[PDB]
A and B are shown apart, each in its own frame.
Chain A
Amino acid sequence: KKYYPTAEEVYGPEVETIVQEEDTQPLTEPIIKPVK
């Protein structure tokens, strides 16, 4: 177990806390213009 409060009850229920660890465009997407 752990003794720490959740982020949903500390940042407010009206907002949405976003947390991103990894796995987002591995040096391919924002390098060049996308294939339209």
Chain B
Amino acid sequence: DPDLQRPDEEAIKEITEKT
């Protein structure tokens, strides 16, 4: 789950805001 699952929602939202 640490290296097989996708990333968290907060980091994905921050990356989406930066993009």
Q: Do chains A and B touch in the complex (CB under 8 A)?
A: no
